[PDB]
Design a protein around this nucleic acid. Structure first.
Lengths: 59, 182, 142, 82
RNA sequence: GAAGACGGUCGAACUUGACUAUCUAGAGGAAGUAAAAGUCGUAACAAGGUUUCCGUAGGUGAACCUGCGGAAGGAUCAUUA
RNA sequence: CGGGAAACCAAAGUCUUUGGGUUCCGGGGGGAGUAUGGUUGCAAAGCUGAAACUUAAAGGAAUUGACGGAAGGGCACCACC
RNA sequence: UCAGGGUUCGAUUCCGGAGAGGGAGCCUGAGAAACGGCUACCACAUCCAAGGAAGGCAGCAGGCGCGCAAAUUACCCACUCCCGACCCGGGGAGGUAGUGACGAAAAAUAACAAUACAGGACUCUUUCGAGGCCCUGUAAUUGGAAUGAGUCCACUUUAAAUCCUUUAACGAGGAUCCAUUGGAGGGCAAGUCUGGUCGCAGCAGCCGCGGUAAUUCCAGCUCCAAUAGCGUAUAUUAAAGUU
């Protein structure tokens, strides 16, 4: 009732081809970042009555 | 060594409707964080609770009279509150903006001397603003009534006079060493 | 209303309540000091022990996996306890005769998930944090 | 990449008694994809999974055939005696 | 007017039993539990093909069977003479 | 009327508009009416009554099919006659 | 811990009580059954030329052991007070610095135009089309406009210093003077992703995911939330009208 194996321990982590870090930008300091959020969310942000939309969408 | 907390988080944590409300407040009010709002939602709840207790007391009741009038007078000195209000029946029917409206940051906008709730906070936190003999760097301040008029740039920050700027003064000597001579 | 209503009857009401509190399991646990007396951890929140052996435990249906815990002798009271080793290949990081910091599931003493009869998890070895080890912030020192 | 096994006895409910050709009797658990259409027998070849766990036990993954058994001499697994 | 010293009182401590409370080792043994996808029977979900179940006693590979008194939560809210 | 989750209930009513008197038992399900001590018993047994561990549903009610070696049921030579 | 009722804790900056290795006894003195007094036994430990002899950090530091867990073998009697024969001395009382994300307060890591554009309510026009206010981004770099974090003459602090609160000389074009920690299937805020795997590794408090188009995994990308903090474990409380 245990017997069995571990041979396979860590098989996916070790098979998952590493990815670069890439990079890019810094996102913004405290209140300024809050400000960008508020303009992007609300000012931005006009929205349509498209019956809605999304934040982390592709096509 | 006595100390106390100054803010309180909301029972609950994800109520789109509340989140949007707070974000609009941060934006209008050049705020920094939710705590920044939470701190005020907290300030207000205690005031309202202070108010509600009082309002349940008998009028003329030395305790209700002596402390009610005081709460009101305190609330008015800061402009937070007005006279008809200026009784307890009106504080009960009050809100956060009314406080939020009295901080530095939004005033330095409100009379040109910033043109942004933005500009305002970096101005304040950078020492270019006195409330009359005194620099005040606390974008978080709370401008008292007859103190509204004494807010202005400071005696030396450049506007306010005084040479230029550790970066302006760099630039003057930036057209000096090369383009003048060798 | 199952409960006298006489101005006097404080003692009956007070006492009837004392009598029924028992059935509350959290209450009884506390008054019987169970945490001190039965429990492997002292009535403390964390506990450190030595690794005896590595177990591959057979996750309960409808799930199917080999679980991967160690068996640990707690230094404090020589108690024998099996503890889960979380994340991918982390067994790797604990060896027999190891030392380890164990902590509760967050289940109130009740085993977690599909993982059968295991009530604790490893947190530190190399005195050294499986998390920091798994990431590679820090190593299997030696 | 391990050896195989040989069922010796049956238990029932995700339990079967096997006898590893190497001389190790343990209780192997049927495989999930195999059990779908495979019903281990008390007399047949099988493959069970076993890793860093003393090997005292193993789980059944797939099964085998018989007719091929005569070919097993060709499988290079069983000796001139199986 | 000291050491010492007669006898006593308090009495730590020590030695041996008794007492009470709390805790704890243990070859092995027998329960219950999990539980569960196993083996042997069909005991009592469709009248489960022996209606079911309770109290109780005796007995059986095993579910269970059976007598004696209950209940319907039954398969009858009726019986028409 | 009103109650209740409903089945139902003139009491199971007068219960969030929660307060007539008093008594008893329960706090998820299993472990268990079990262990252990006390008590009563000639005996069989009865009363009081845990835990470790186990587990995410146990359970209730109504609704609907499916299905029945339940009742009235039908229909067809893929059923019988 | 907040409806109200309540619910739980309290060794711990004060008050009252108790002890200074365990037990017992006693001297002195107004006050002690005192242990930075003594004395015996009992348990412990130490020096020795072996006959002897000397000791008690639940004081301040520090050290061992223990553990989930806890700081300098630092400076001063100047403050605050205390004691003595005392204005004057003495105080690990106490202050002072060092360590210090228990935890609590303030809240930096970038603001303003301009072109440049991307856009929407407003107006004009039959439409096409154009104007227009409120502006936000988003680059393009500009352009002038900025401040301590560091660094540092001087000065302050104070017993003397440190730091704060003070400032000449320096210190912001992003590749920074470089913000984090959890989450993104449901509850639950946020990928009807791309590569990889294929009920494997893992995820998952609970329900549940993964058996080859994985929105739960493993990674990136992207996005969310709380933010100089955030996750995790645990006692306990609220939620719980499940005492």
């Amino acid at each position: 009732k245990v017997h069995g194996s571990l041979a396979r321990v860590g098989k996916v982590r070790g098979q998952t081809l590493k990815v670069a870090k890439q990079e890019k930008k810094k996102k913004r300091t405290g209140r300024a970042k809050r400000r960008m959020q508020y303009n992007r969310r609300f000012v931005n942000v006009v929205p349509t009555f498209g019956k809605k939309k999304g934040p982390n969408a592709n096509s | 060594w006595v100390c106390r907390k100054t803010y309180v988080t909301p029972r609950r944590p994800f109520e789109k409707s509340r989140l949007d409300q707070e974000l609009k407040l941060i934006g209008e009010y050049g705020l920094r964080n939710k705590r920044e709002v939470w701190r005020v939602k907290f300030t207000l709840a205690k005031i309202r609770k202070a108010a509600r207790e009082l309002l349940t007391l008998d009028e003329k009741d030395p305790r209700r009279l002596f402390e009610g009038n005081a709460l009101l007078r305190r609330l008015v000195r800061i402009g937070v509150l007005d006279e008809g209000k200026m009784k307890l029946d009106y504080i009960l029917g009050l809100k956060i903006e009314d406080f939020l409206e009295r901080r530095l940051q939004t005033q330095v906008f409100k009379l040109g001397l910033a043109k942004s709730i933005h500009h305002a906070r970096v101005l304040i936190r950078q020492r270019h603003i006195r409330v009359r003999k005194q620099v005040v760097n606390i974008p978080s301040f709370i401008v008292r009534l007859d103190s509204q008029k004494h807010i202005d740039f400071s005696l030396r920050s450049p506007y306010g006079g005084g040479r230029p700027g550790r970066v302006k003064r760099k630039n003057a000597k930036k057209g000096q060493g090369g383009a003048g001579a060798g | 209303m199952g409960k006298c209503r006489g101005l006097r009857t404080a003692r009956k009401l007070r006492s009837h309540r004392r009598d029924q509190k028992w059935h509350d399991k959290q209450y009884k646990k506390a008054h019987l000091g169970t945490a001190l007396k039965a429990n492997p951890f002292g009535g403390a929140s964390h506990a450190k022990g030595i690794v005896l052996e590595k177990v591959g435990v057979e996750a309960k249906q409808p799930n199917s996996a080999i679980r991967k815990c160690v068996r640990v002798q707690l230094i404090k009271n020589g108690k024998k306890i099996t503890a889960f080793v979380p994340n991918d290949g982390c067994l790797n990081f604990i060896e027999e005769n190891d030392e380890v910091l164990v902590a509760g599931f967050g289940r109130k003493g009740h085993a977690v998930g599909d993982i059968p009869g295991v009530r604790f998890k490893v947190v530190k070895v190399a005195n050294v944090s499986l998390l920091a080890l798994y990431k590679g912030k820090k190593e299997r020192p030696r | 990449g391990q050896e195989y096994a040989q069922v010796i006895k049956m238990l029932g409910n995700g339990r079967l008694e096997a006898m590893c050709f190497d001389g190790v009797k343990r209780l192997c658990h049927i495989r999930g994809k195999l059990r779908k259409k495979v019903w281990i027998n008390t007399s047949d070849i099988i493959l069970v999974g076993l890793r860093d766990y003393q090997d005292n036990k193993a789980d059944v993954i797939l099964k085998y055939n018989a007719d091929e058994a005569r070919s097993l001499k060709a499988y290079g697994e069983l000796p001139e005696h199986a």
